[PDB]
A paper describes a structure:
Bacteriorhodopsin is a light-driven pump that provides proton vectorial transport across the cell membrane of the archaea. It consists of 7 transmembrane α-helices (7TM) with the retinal molecule bound covalently to the Lys 216 residue and belongs to the 7TM protein superfamily. As part of one of the simplest energy production mechanisms in the cell, bR is of great interest for bioenergetics. BR is a widely used model for expression, folding, crystallization of MPs and X-ray crystallography.
Since the expression levels of the native bR, SRII, SR1-8bRΔ(0–9), and bR0-9SRΔ(1–8) correlated with the stability of the (-4, +47) region of mRNA structure, we introduced into the wild type bR gene two silent mutations (C9A, G12A corresponding to amino acids Ala2 and Gln3) that increase the free energy by 6.2 kcal/mol and significantly reduce the stem stability. When we utilized a mild detergent for solubilization of E. coli membranes and the non-denaturing protocol for protein purification, bR expressed from the optimized gene retained its purple color. With the wild type bR, D85N and D96N mutant proteins we set up nanovolume in meso crystallization trials which yielded crystals within 5–10 days for all proteins. The crystals belonged to the spacegroup C2 with three monomers in the asymmetric unit that form a trimer. Typically for in meso crystallization, the protein molecules form membrane-like layers, with purple membrane-like packing within the layer. Despite the absence of native Halobacterium salinarum lipids, the intertrimer distance is essentially identical to that of the crystals obtained with purple membrane-derived bacteriorhodopsin. The structure of the protein and its trimer is also identical to that of purple membrane-derived bacteriorhodopsin. Data reveal the essential features of the structure, including the retinal cofactor and the hydrogen bond-linked cluster of water molecules close to the Schiff base. The growth of the first highly ordered 3D crystals of bR expressed in E. coli and the similarity of its structure to the structure of bR obtained from H. salinarum show the aptness of the presented approach for the expression of bR and its mutants suitable for all scientific and industrial applications. Our work demonstrates that bR expressed in E. coli is readily crystallized by in meso approach and, therefore, native lipids surrounding the protein are not an absolute requirement for growing well diffracting bR crystals.
Residue numbers in the entry:
A (entry chain C): 4 to 231
B (entry chain B): 4 to 156, 162 to 232
C (entry chain A): 4 to 232
């Protein structure tokens, strides 16, 4: 397990997601309000799933080798299995906060599925050039998501009660800033250009993941915005 | 890319699904009615997902080789990844149009999953004879879905007329899929892969973009 | 098809899930109550999905080989593809009976996904010791589910009409008993310690599966509890 330099970040990630899950689990005990139960369920599931995928990477299961650019490249595919479930859950937290229309929720979840799915195909693609075609489609989907979060129902948040509008705006900002970093890290890291070593890329995703999951959840579950 | 003769149909499919997606995206802008939003979201996602899977097939990612009949057979598995998501969305469009009960929506989506899932298992199965067992199970699931669309469902006249048209389009186009599979490279191998690819492309664009044009052009999508 | 000794149990499972599916399909015909329609849809899909996965195992498609402990180990991965969909559906039946809040349903479905997903990872893991780490995580998720069924639903079912309360308690007990057996069979079977041969393990899972699906469904769909109003 300790052979590759990035093991320490995978271990740390596993530990932080695990601790985060247990905290949210305990914190959610006794909560009887139906709306709050939804938020605790969603928000506890996110780092619980991430925990399993961090462990998969730590133990070697979530790592494969993909040929491109004339070499065999180490790819952690477990990330996508994590994000496939956790990113729409995070979007669901936001959508519930502002009471979004079901059509808008479906649009977000589907666009997010496309984003992660094309990211995965890009990550596993054996023809170097095509990798970035997938990256571009995935980024278009992300920009669509960010557009909806800002110009999609941001008006609905404003016309909610102050505690909701306020918590939403904070979490929206966190989301846009943190999520926007992912395509950059992918682009300069091992999946893409190979400018940053895998060790550092893994550290970067770990810091992003923990912030976007546990950080995000702390802010959300600490707020009275979750109560109906 | 140009190495496989079917590339031209995969390229055309990619372009038409993409163009269709962009059109539905723009057309859906500034739509505020909750029900209409639902239909636009569903109907826009359909060719968006199909666009990605056509591109996957065009670029070679969504192609594999399955041994059966003593040979190595080219199988585009990407189709099932597409249909797994897009066919239930299309059924959802129809179900919402008639305000179907949740139990019925679950039955349709579930049967559809079984249809595509067994289709995929058949497509990847290495014993030639068994491939057709899976085809028969999948076809039974399709027949169940068709039965429900005709017998398993009192609505305003715009809704009733758009539904009937979309249902008939669906029943006719979907029924062609099992035939194309049976005679094509996945089944008997009577029709060569480049022609089969052309056939699925015409069917897919009609069942997705054509279907969507009829639906999103109708007043049926707006909630009284 | 008869080349592996467990074939007979896979054939029997296929037939029992198939028959159960056809019986539930026919029984559900003409049911117009919206609530009952949900229960029939859920409950019929369960054995229908199980039927396809039993057939996949029977035909050899849902079998792979995984090296660990100095052997090539036969692993039926099709079980996880089955359980991934059928276990959440079974949980859904229970949740609807007691009119569970959405948040509780999502918690159950999410925990169930983790249970099956980590079970699958454990099943395919080539480092022998790590297989049991996954098993333990999966078992933790199962225990969480069982906790919810007892300290979330049993409380919400008691405050319901008597037919419902009664049918739920039976189905809850059937579920807790049967589901608890799965991690044990896995642990001592081919996926784990290898104390019980594969043919016997397949018999065990078949009896459990048929009871947990068709048995469960027979108890549920016979009850008046599936009707609303
Ligand atoms: C070259 C063609 C490019 C096509 C790219 C394929 C898709 C990948 C990238 C972005 C699109 C993904 C989001 C589509 C769903 C939008 C729902 C639209 O509906 C919306 C609701 O009405 C809002 O509530
Ligand atoms: C030889 C055995 C074959 C077993 C069939 C499984 C594979 C082939 C599939 C056939 C159709 C499956 C439909 C299952 C949904 C039943 C919903 C039940 O009904 C539903 C509500 O009641 C209606 O709203
Ligand atoms: C040291 C590492 C250990 C970390 C544990 C990893 C978790 C894997 C096993 C089980 C986790 C499943 C619980 C997630 C759902 C709880 C939502 C909470 O629901 C909430 C609502 O109020 C309930 O209705
Ligand atoms: C909870 C994650 C920490 C696991 C670290 C594994 C240590 C391996 C040392 C050999
Ligand atoms: C409604 C949810 C649909 C999920 C989108 C599926 C993602 C497609 C994969 C593209 C690669
Ligand atoms: C009251 C706040 C303390 C909660 C402990 C959270 C569990 C540890 C997870 C790591 C937090 C990283 C934040 C970014
Ligand atoms: C309700 C959703 C369940 C879908 C069943 C898919 C099963 C695939 C069969 C192979
Ligand atoms: C206007 C949308 C452009 C995509 C072409 C779709 C053609 C429809 C086929 C019926
Ligand atoms: C007619 C019911 C389907 C046949 C299988 C019966 C087995 C019940 C298991 C308890
Ligand atoms: C909303 C519930 C969906 C989450 C399912 C999580 C499955 C994760 C698989 C773990 C390996
Ligand atoms: C009163 C109902 C008790 C059900 C538990 C059955 C125990 C089975 C033994 C294992």
């Amino acid at each position: 397990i300790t052979g590759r330099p990035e093991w320490i970040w995978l271990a740390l990630g596993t530990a932080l997601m695990g601790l985060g899950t247990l905290y949210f689990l305990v914190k959610g005990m006794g909560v009887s309000d139906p709306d709050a139960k939804k938020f605790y369920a969603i928000t506890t599931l996110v780092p619980a799933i991430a925990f399993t995928m961090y462990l998969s990477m730590l133990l070697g299961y979530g790592l494969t080798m993909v040929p491109f650019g004339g070499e065999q490249n180490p790819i952690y595919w477990a990330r996508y299995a994590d994000w496939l479930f956790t990113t729409p859950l995070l979007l669901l937290d936001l959508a519930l906060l502002v009471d979004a229309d079901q059509g808008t929720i479906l649009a977000l979840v589907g666009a997010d599925g496309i984003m992660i799915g094309t990211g995965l195909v890009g990550a596993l693609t054996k023809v170097y050039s095509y990798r970035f075609v997938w990256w571009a489609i995935s980024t278009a989907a992300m920009l669509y998501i960010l557009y909806v979060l800002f110009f999609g129902f941001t008006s609905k948040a404003e016309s909610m009660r102050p505690e909701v509008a306020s918590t939403f705006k904070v979490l929206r900002n966190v989301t846009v800033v943190l999520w926007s970093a992912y395509p950059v890290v992918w682009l300069i890291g091992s999946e893409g250009a190979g400018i940053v070593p895998l060790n550092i890329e893994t550290l970067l995703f770990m810091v992003l993941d923990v912030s976007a999951k546990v950080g995000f959840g702390l802010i959300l579950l600490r707020s009275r915005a979750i109560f109906g």
